Design an enzyme around this catalytic site. Sequence first.
Site, PDB file in Angstrom:
ATOM      1  N   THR A 207       0.846  -1.091  -0.056  1.00 17.82           N
ATOM      2  CA  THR A 207      -0.079   0.002  -0.122  1.00 17.82           C
ATOM      3  C   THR A 207       0.875   1.232   0.058  1.00 17.82           C
ATOM      4  OG1 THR A 207      -1.658  -1.217   1.417  1.00 17.82           O
ATOM      5  CG2 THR A 207      -1.689   1.060   1.140  1.00 17.82           C
ATOM      6  N   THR A 208       0.457   2.326  -0.580  1.00 15.32           N
ATOM      7  CA  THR A 208       1.154   3.757  -0.482  1.00 15.32           C
ATOM      8  C   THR A 208       0.144   4.445  -0.672  1.00 15.32           C
ATOM      9  OG1 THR A 208       3.015   2.992  -1.790  1.00 15.32           O
ATOM     10  CG2 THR A 208       2.754   5.372  -1.325  1.00 15.32           C
TER      11      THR A 208
END
Lengths: 240, 230, 196, 220, 238, 247, 204, 203, 244
Positions: free
Chosen positions: H1-2
């Site tokens: 995830t970013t």
Amino acid sequence: TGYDLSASTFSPDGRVFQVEYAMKAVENSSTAIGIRCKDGVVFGVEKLVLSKLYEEGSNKRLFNVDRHVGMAVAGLLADARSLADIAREEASNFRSNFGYNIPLKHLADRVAMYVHAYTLYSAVRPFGCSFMLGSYSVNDGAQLYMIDPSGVSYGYWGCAIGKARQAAKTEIEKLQMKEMTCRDIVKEVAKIIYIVHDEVKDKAFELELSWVGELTNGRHEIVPKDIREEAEKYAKESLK
Amino acid sequence: RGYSFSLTTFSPSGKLVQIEYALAAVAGGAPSVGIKAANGVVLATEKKQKSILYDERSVHKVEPITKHIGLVYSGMGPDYRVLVHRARKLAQQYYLVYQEPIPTAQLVQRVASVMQEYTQSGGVRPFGVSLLICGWNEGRPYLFQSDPSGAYFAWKATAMGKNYVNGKTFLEKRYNEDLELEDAIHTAILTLKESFEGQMTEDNIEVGICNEAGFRRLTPTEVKDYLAAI
Amino acid sequence: MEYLIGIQGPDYVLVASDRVAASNIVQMKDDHDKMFKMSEKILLLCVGEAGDTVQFAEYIQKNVQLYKMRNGYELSPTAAANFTRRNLADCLRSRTPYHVNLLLAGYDEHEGPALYYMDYLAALAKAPFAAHGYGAFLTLSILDRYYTPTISRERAVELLRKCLEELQKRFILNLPTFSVRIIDKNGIHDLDNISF
Amino acid sequence: TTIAGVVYKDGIVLGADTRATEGMVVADKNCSKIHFISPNIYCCGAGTAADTDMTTQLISSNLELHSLSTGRLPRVVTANRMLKQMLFRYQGYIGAALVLGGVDVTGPHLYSIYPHGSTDKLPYVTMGSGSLAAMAVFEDKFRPDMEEEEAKNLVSEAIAAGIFNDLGSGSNIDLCVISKNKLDFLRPYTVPNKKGTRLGRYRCEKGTTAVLTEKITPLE
Amino acid sequence: FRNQYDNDVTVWSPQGRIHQIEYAMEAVKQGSATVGLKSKTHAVLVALKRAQSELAAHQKKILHVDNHIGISIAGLTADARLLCNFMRQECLDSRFVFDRPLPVSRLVSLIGSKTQIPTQRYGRRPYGVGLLIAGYDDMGPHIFQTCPSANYFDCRAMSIGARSQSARTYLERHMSEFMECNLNELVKHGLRALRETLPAEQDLTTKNVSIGIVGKDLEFTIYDDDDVSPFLEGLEER
Amino acid sequence: SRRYDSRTTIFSPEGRLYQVEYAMEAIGHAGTCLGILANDGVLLAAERRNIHKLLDEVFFSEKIYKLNEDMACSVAGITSDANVLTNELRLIAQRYLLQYQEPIPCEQLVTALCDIKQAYTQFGGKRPFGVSLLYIGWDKHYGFQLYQSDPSGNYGGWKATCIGNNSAAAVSMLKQDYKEGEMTLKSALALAIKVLNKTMDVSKLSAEKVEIATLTRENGKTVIRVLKQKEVEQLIKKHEEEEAKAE
Amino acid sequence: SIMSYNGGAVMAMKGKNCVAIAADRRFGIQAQMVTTDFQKIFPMGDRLYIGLAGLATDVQTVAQRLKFRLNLYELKEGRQIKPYTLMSMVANLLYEKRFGPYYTEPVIAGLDPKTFKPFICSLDLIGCPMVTDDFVVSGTCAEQMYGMCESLWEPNMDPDHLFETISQAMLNAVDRDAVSGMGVIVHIIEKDKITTRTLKARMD
Amino acid sequence: TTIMAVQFDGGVVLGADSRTTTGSYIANRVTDKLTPIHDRIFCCRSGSAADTQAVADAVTYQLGFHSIELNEPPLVHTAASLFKEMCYRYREDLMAGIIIAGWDPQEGGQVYSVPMGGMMVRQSFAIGGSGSSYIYGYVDATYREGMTKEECLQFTANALALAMERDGSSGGVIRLAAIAESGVERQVLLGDQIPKFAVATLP
Amino acid sequence: SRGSSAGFDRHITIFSPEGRLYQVEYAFKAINQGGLTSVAVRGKDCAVIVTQKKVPDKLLDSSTVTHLFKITENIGCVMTGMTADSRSQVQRARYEAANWKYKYGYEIPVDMLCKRIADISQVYTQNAEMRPLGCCMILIGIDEEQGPQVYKCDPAGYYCGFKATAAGVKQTESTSFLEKKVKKKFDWTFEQTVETAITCLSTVLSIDFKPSEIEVGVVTVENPKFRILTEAEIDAHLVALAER
């Protein structure tokens, strides 16, 4: 009668008489007024000190229930301190859950619903006090509500609770209070408290003043003793 | 918070007067007629609809419980909503245990047990409703009545509400065992017309039928078609 | 390890148990009774974890005696076995399990004699003979070899003594004396303690 | 287990295999893995099979309460909320990995409801052991707004790839087509593998099995 | 016209009054007189001690709450002891959490918060005891008065109990002298106030006088039968 | 709250329990139910108050309830309280069977229900269960048994008794016609229909208005069956013949 | 394994208007045989049996609590239970203990109490029902039993071929299990009678 | 995830990737990790998907009821205090790092980080997720005071594209959202819309 | 009979010997004890609220003195009766609407919220320890399938849908006047519905309103949010009916 023994009983007219009797306990109390104005709210209590043996500061009827809210009560003063501590709990838990100072509308709604919660049941009686909440912030401005023993919470420009609330309100209505600073509202409040005080009955009282507004940066504080002495001086010379 | 004592107690003659006063509330309620036909059950009732401002298609008196069980009442409407809700929950608790549609008699036992519980437990009044509970299983139609006492009777045809005793004499005079379901709808509408007073439309009565296809309320077009030549 | 054995004849149940209480190296008591009189014709023989045996079995004993007090008649040995099994099985998955191995001996007036095996999980098994302990491994084959269902009680005491002589010969723990009781229509009878 | 679903132009096509394994042994050759929730919503189930059974039956009961109380057609978002809030409430210890799909007043909605309570609203989802074979077929051959028979052929092709590429999947393809007007529950849709026919005739006759004791207990 | 308004505490009268609260205040109007009073340095409680018979000892009036707070009860002694155990527990909780003496005003506010609760709940009853609470903290000495109406009073001096109107008359007359008195003068003023509550024939002895003092460097100490003789004499006649 | 309290579980100044006696009065106005012990069976015999209308008769009986494999009962009083009590009797019988793996003796089941009725007459502030019950049963301890409970939680062993309407005249007839130890099942059926005929002052005695159930032992199994109305008509016509032989 | 503590083997098999249920008879602590007459098939009706393999204390417990809930059902309900409804009752009873689970895996063989339609199913230890049309098996010799039943089951068998098939399946399966055997009891459930036979089995 | 959220003058820009992994299997490749809490308040979700969904649903519930009580649009500090209260009270129970970013009439565009453990801090820009580690250096050397909406959108898209390039748990499409007084503008970058960065091949 | 009584039946919510519940009827009188009257009428694409607004005191903040309440963004209500009881049902309605959206993913319908508040209000009429709330709640909103919906729940627990409804002192006069203006036509537009409401109230009150003396809340299909009209907008409608 038969219909006035419970707060879970209506009259044949549709009246809950225990609530009305609690409000008659409110109109046995001496008058507390509060005037919302342009830059804040000033409370004032005709604090009847019944004996000379009490300290000057006994039985305070002005309550700090958050650091932006004050509370002027009138009625059965033990129930008043109970509701003040409820309002403190409510403002504290608002800050602890939501992260900011409670709006005076929402504080008055929650404490009024706590008051209404004792007008439904026979296991409790209604509170015997009306009280006025007054706050100030940059966004909300000056705000003044009032909550009766039934739990009705309305907004006010000037409000009065106690035994001489009609004389107090007809002297508050004479003011263009919307365009005044608090430093003139204190002299107005002191004038009204000394006008409505009956002097053949229940003499020797104390004037207990407070404000919240611009001049305390939103903090609810009692009026300082120099300003309270000059307000009482104005009120004494204006009472004639 | 609540009271912990019965408000329904015994009188010196042996009566439970709060149950009898709930029966007085039922007898003053709107007339409902139940008829168990040979291949179905009809439940017809009278929508006491004065004040045409009322949305006549908003609140239903005939009200399903399962695919195969429907209620109708006489008496106090909000108590009927409580019994509808409890009957729906009890029926689905049977379906959660046994993965089978609940039998009609078993649901009537459970809802009658609820109505018993509010005649003995603390600080309550009884329900001011009698129910008519229809239902189909095992190829056989069922018609039951649950009293405000919580006693339950099985009827071949019955009526409740206002003028219920003359309606029950009328149902004694009209009902027979080989009567079909459309004849049951006809005779149920006739029984409601026997104490109607005020020109039946498709919107001031309400009929629901239960058969092998399940339970359904009739649409007002179908009710208008059953009110034809009537 | 502690040893129990029951032998169920035509009209009697013969039970014996080792008469030893030990604390892991020493025999602290050599006249210790593992038999518990439930009613006038029911013995419950209990071995297992220390503490659980006496607590569980005195619970069972007070409830069976309480049944007799409430009702004027006793539990049948079948009903006593199922009651014991039910309490042990309920306590199995509770916070306080009982790790007890049980032989319930009994004579019913109608059912005849009855013996019941019960392990610590509360599996109940009616049996013509049964035994617990590690000595059961040595003695149950002798019982399979020599028991017939029409055994007299004198031959039952001789077969019991064969089992106990096997425990003296071959088993590794010292089990010198054995409390021997018999239940029949006349009640529970202390037989002579088989000693070595 | 290989369960999957797509969203086509008019609705939902769900798909499942029919193998139930207890260990590495086939228990049931005809498991039913597409579960009834409401008349417009079904649910495919993977994971702990008793958990999926009891979970989808509980949510079918809750939506029958909800739809009898509202008098309306139940939504797929309501079943989605009920499933994810309960599965989060039980911390993932109920292993109900679910493919939820149905058609309402707002159109077709497809959901993959994982056992910890996370949900994904996707046009095409796969769950189960053979989920990556089926997702290989989906990522190979999916188009948005396909026809009904194209979507049925796609879902059964993906379930068939799960059958022929996963040891925990096999024996049949069930489909459940949902649209705004129609509910087709196809069981079995495709039968890929049959049992090979028996060569030796055994025919165990009376007197082969020796019997010690015999009891006849008549009725009525 | 009052018979249904005076049996529960959750019933208001049509005059806006709760009669069970007023009855529990009669319960402290019929206790023996006790006198609280303070100077700038000290706060002394002076209490008569009735005896049920000549052979019985005197019922004790002055209790210990903490090393800086003492109380003198009037009214029902079991509610008095229960409320005093509440006060002792709160002072112990303050010294455990904060390692400092609980302020006397905050303890009296906790007493008001406790005693208001049964005056509003059904089947409960007001604590039928009035306290004179002598305390000393950072804000000097304190005399407090509590009521079964749950109201608390912050007093220059106060007397409660039976025949305490005469004592309140004396204390109103001579309270302008109290702040400059030393300890012994203040206790003699309290004894004269207490002696005003007696009949004309009764005089204060070492039997019926109990004195509790809390001060600046003085913890709360109860002075009893032999210990009150340095204070009782003195003394002016009546 | 104390004004609205009913005080159902207090004594009278004569030391009586008012609600128990009023529930007993309610059972005194209920439908007639009788039971008779014999050497080879026990019976029940119940008047139908829900008798003659557009009723359906779905169940196997209006007023006879099977409690376990070995016992039946019959009620008189509040039919909803009767349903509560019969459900609780079935639960007690099955909890005994769970705990001991043998069917419950009859006096234990009756005692266990009467403990619940005494609990609602002593504490809890609720109204008492206004139901009397007649219990029939076989067990391996005391055999064929007949019991009679009441809202107080009292019970007793009977050889012939009656609850409901006209139970005083019914128990007087059961004094003046019963033979201790000489009763078989058929003679007890005759006595049952005799007492039911002479304790119904309204209507000609009709077999659509009574339920008669028997409890016998066949082959080591308890057979509980409510007698079909063909048999009940045949027994009523036998009573007609035995009264026509009084001339 | 806790399931293989006492051993056990039950299978149920469906025929032509008849079902067969069969159990081994060994009760055993572990490797120690204790008795040879242990009841694992329980009657839950006239034409409806349940067979429980697994942990023997839970065998006895589930049979007794099922007979508890079943007798309450048949008294309150006024009828014999259908085999599907019995299956959902057992699945509820086992799933109530989802995290504290009854170490038993029941098979249910029966006929419908109205149309006499054959029913077999089995459940796992947490109550997952599995209705088959050929056979269900349960116990410590499960793979043996599936092999013998896939090899010997035919559709539409009269109760003679049904008895011979479940007989040979149970015998040849329990002769490959150490903790199963010591006798095989077979029930044949027909519309008119129940046939209970015990088989000559190896006792080692 | 970013996940990422950058404050500008007049509002905020939120941005997330779209990859949900089950180990190294991409379970969802188009995950919407921006959640509308209120009308001008979003949250960025990183961490356990079940935990972040449940906490975002519960704060959506509490904040909607709070805003209907007060007859006001809610504050962004209020939404972040609710996430902080729920993510701190259950900090042993949850794996949830949340960036709350939105707009309010009283204080403007605000971005608050509520990382795992459950603290809360107002930041000018905030990154989070498994992939945010790869772009700490880029966002520190690149962030400017006083950027516009378009510069903050391009900065968020660039830093997300970099983190999605190096992280395996990050990837998919870039879901952007700019929240101001005027409303919420959401957009998806995909294919060539995602900023490309040339791989240093050997010359 | 003829309105007889026996026992505590006038004091707690138990039955009279006729089967009535006197405390519920007394709560219906407690509605009228407030002395205000609200009127709501449903259109074809709209639903509107009009109500009285008495500020006799002039020290009251008139913006805070209201009976219009936003329950959710789409559902609004007017309250009639005892003000604190009314505000308690407003808090409970806001709770049930928010909890519905949380549990179910879609906003609560107006019939379901009114059914929910009515099923709450029934419990007050059956348990003796509490009194019924003396308030009348009229919910309006736009249904996704049925369009505009006005719904009213009472102290008894009866709810129905309404084509037009009213509560308060002049409820019977408003019911007669709306039976007049509903039998012939629904008098529909957004303009005709907000004018049928203000005509009903100013007809059964006969006061010939100022815009500072009432307040209006609308829902429409075009603007589904519950919106309060301002004094300028109510003044525009008063000019539109003052020119006739």
